């Protein structure tokens with residue numbers, strides 16, 4: 002069996018999708034522009050029909066931890082070298098594939114970014130940054146990126162996290178885990194459903210990991226407030242027979258003094274560690290991880306820094322943009338609170 006739902010494009014289907022993405026790259030200035038953000042979900046209706054059928058059906062299945070699409074061609078010569086930093090990572094060689102990710106994402110929901118992550122970009126980059134090997138962010142390498150719900154701190158966190166592998170020559174694995182429902186006893190389960198846990202914002206929302214500028218400044222105040230004064234929240238929500246999950250291995254904690262909550266979180270850590278499995282996104286593979294059913298991470302790897310490091314494009318997707326209207330800056334798709 003497979004804990005995720007998988008689709009493999011035929012070469013003709015893959016070529017057609019690539020051609021559509023190239024057409025979009027020709028007609029629009031950028032992926033994050035207001036025009037393409039609005040048009041992408043409608044343009045996505047032109048994608049191969051079998052793919053559209055897969056995305057419409059697979060999103061509605063009860064079981065998958067992710068939707069995986071294999072077989073998008075990528076030419077390393079045309080792509081160019083892996084950028085040394087996310088700031089300069091919008092290279093012409095990666096441009097069509099960024100449009101492709103956006104088109105696929107449009108079939109699943111509304112895309113958005115954060116004013117406090119990678120300068121408010123909607124399509125972001127995952128690549129190893131020299132000197133940042135042992136950090137808690139996605140540009141780490143030598144230190145494993147521990148399992149987490151994406152943006153667990155925030156009620157406006159994505160429903161799906163999309164990852165498109167531009168290159169991954171050494172087959173470094175993305176990690177995944179669902180709710181360990183086969184092992185959680187009912188008392189522990191009960192406690193995890195109660196608002197007895199603290200979840201702070203991760204290091205990607207700190208000013209040090211964004212560019213020096215006077216734009217998207219006030220949104221860092223809300224991040225500080227979530228870090229300093231986290232309100233108690235639940236880890237599990239919804240149906241007891243199929244709970245949704247909100248946890249971060251490195252940023253979760255029990256409510257102060259709450260030893261029963263602590264025991265439940267401790268047990269959850271153990272059970273998630275034991276059931277964590279691997280998904281290798283080879284060059285051209287795309288994954289849309291269900292951020293409510295599963296946590297994810299990335300295995301430790303030795304970075305190359307020779308121009309051919311592992312490199313992903315990434316995007317946040319919500320089923321309903323209006324859920325986060327508090328955090329709207331204006332008419333943009335960039336979230337953050339004061």
Ligand SMILES: N=C(N)NCCCC[C@H](N)C(=O)O
Pocket residue numbers: 137138139140146147148149203204205249250251252
């Ligand atoms: N357990 C950890 N490390 N949690 C934080 C994960 C960081 C993900 C973030 N969007 C990034 O791009 O770094």
Ligand SMILES: O=C(O)CCC(=O)C(=O)O
Pocket residue numbers: 127139146151164174175176297298299313315
């Ligand atoms: O590198 C990966 O496969 C996933 C990285 C990740 O968890 C993220 O960017 O949020």
Ligand SMILES: [Fe+2]
Pocket residue numbers: 149151162297298
């Ligand atoms: Fe993540």
